[PDB]
Amino acid sequence: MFNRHMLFDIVSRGSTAELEGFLPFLLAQKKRLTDEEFREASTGKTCLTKALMNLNGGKNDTIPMLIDIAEKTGNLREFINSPFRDVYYRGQTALHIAIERRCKHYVELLVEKGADVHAQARGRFFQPKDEGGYFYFGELPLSLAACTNQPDIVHYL
Amino acid sequence: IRLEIKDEEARHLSRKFRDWAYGPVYSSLYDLSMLDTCGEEVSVLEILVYNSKVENRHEMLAVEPINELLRDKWQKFGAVSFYI
């Protein structure tokens, strides 16, 4: 459809055939992918961040497609590097999520299209237990990959 | 108490859940359906204390949720009732 609620669902459905014609649709209504409304007003969760949450065996084909749509609008360093705008999960990006769920194929995709390595997930959730958070890793994706028992991203970063 | 059913039709009666699994940290979820009966007749936990005369009640309180369920209402009611 032409609204946001259809789009935030189908990404979790993971059906790229139900996302066709939307790249010319943004050419019509001049809208960017992270302009005002295709992003959660409460958190800042975008379509790419939603794509990495719900996975189909750790694979969603919308993930290069959401970068593809962002390339035509010219937001490759923005649609990837848009952190969370909330307070509790503040600063978490899509780079933090892909390292989290061990999508080594998708970690390589983010940086090659342009990803901020030094994005800090400095939210209140990412604090130590004395500060109120549940898990601490030093706010860094390089440190996150070491904390997830995964040296494979550590070799890649 | 540790009841998690894979059949996906008898799911609404499952007891143990999985909220979020961010790597090393798992977020389990136990239902307090009959453990702390607020406005009901009689509870599980009450029979563990007031009614059961079996020796195994020391081990039986050492099950997973009740070790943390008793620490819930202790932190809320212990400091208050002592000060009174």
Side-chain angles (χ1 to χ4, degrees), chain B residues 16-39 42-81:
Chain B
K16 187 175 177 66
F17 294 98
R18 180 65 58 85
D19 290 329
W20 52 268
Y22 188 73
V25 176
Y26 291 161
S27 178
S28 65
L29 189 69
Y30 292 102
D31 192 5
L32 297 175
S33 178
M34 296 302 291
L35 293 175
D36 194 1
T37 62
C38 184
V42 64
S43 175
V44 175
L45 185 62
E46 297 173 353
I47 301 171
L48 294 173
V49 175
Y50 292 158
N51 289 317
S52 175
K53 301 287 103 176
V54 187
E55 184 67 28
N56 294 318
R57 63 190 292 170
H58 300 287
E59 179 66 29
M60 196 176 298
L61 292 175
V63 299
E64 177 66 29
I66 298 172
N67 290 319
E68 291 181 353
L69 193 274
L70 292 172
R71 295 179 67 191
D72 295 329
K73 58 185 71 176
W74 187 264
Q75 290 179 354
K76 292 185 288 292
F77 289 159
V80 176
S81 67

Side-chain angles (χ1 to χ4, degrees), chain A residues 96 100 125-126 134-135 144 147, chain B residues 19-25 27:
Chain A
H96 295 284
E100 178 68 28
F125 178 70
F126 299 107
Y134 290 163
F135 182 74
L144 184 63
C147 291
Chain B
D19 290 329
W20 52 268
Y22 188 73
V25 176
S27 178

Side-chain angles (χ1 to χ4, degrees), chain A residues 11 15-17 19-23 26 33 47-48 51 60-70 72-73 76 79 106 109 113:
Chain A
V11 173
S15 65
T16 63
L19 295 173
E20 65 182 2
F22 181 70
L23 179 62
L26 293 178
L33 289 67
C47 296
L48 184 61
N60 285 319
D61 293 331
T62 66
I63 301 168
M65 295 304 292
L66 288 172
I67 300 169
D68 194 5
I69 300 169
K72 273 76 177 175
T73 61
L76 294 175
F79 180 72
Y106 292 97
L109 185 63
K113 300 292 181 68

